[PDB]
Design goal:
The complex is a heterodimer.
Chain A: E1 3-12
Chain B: E1 5-6, E2 10-19, E3 28-29, E4 33-40, E5 48-54, E6 63-64, E7 73-77, E8 89-93, E9 101-111, E10 119-131
Antiparallel strand pairs in B: 1-4, 3-9, 4-9, 5-8, 5-10, 6-7, 7-9
The chains are: A mainly beta, B mainly beta.
The complex binds cobalt (II) ion (CO) (4 copies).
PDB class: cell adhesion
Keywords: Complex, Protein, FimGt, cell adhesion
Assembly: dimeric
Chain lengths: 15, 132
């Protein structure tokens, strides 16, 4: 790979 | 053609905190978030850069979440309404005035089947460039 896109996040539990 | 210098070897996009209740229904999604790729010092004679995208996909065709949140996939698009799932390509023109090329992109999380569960979102999309 010449470039990489890293995707981040979090799913919080609000029901 | 001769290659350019990859300026953005790694790029991150942070979708931030999403909420399970908002991702309960099939078809729910996050907002779009920007990410971009850039090449510089493009040699004279190189006028186009093609980015080829690859990464692990799931049964929806979108990029699979490798984090712990379940029932989440990731969608990558360009700036023109084209989805760039694994195997897709995008070509842009080199800007002669700056000898650079860039790819403005956007990402969202979506839950095709509904019922996203708590946990991390983590995915990696790999890009290889070809020059013409
Ligand atoms: Co955000
Ligand atoms: Co963060
Ligand atoms: Co944003
Ligand atoms: Co632009």
């Amino acid at each position: 790979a010449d470039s990489r896109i890293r995707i981040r996040g979090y799913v919080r539990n609000n029901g | 053609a001769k290659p350019c210098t990859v300026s953005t070897t790694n790029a991150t996009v942070d979708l931030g905190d999403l909420y399970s209740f908002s991702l309960m229904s099939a078809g729910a999604a996050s907002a779009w978030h920007d990410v971009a790729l850039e090449l510089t010092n493009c040699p004279v004679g190189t006028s186009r850069v093609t980015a080829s995208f690859s990464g692990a996909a799931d049964s929806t065709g979108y990029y699979k979440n490798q984090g712990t949140a379940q029932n989440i996939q990731l969608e990558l698009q360009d700036d023109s309404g084209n989805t760039l799932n694994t195997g897709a390509t995008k070509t842009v023109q080199v800007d002669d005035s700056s000898q650079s090329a860039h790819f403005p992109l956007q990402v969202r999380a979506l839950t095709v089947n509904g019922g996203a569960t708590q946990g991390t979102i983590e995915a990696v999309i790999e890009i290889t460039y070809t020059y013409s």
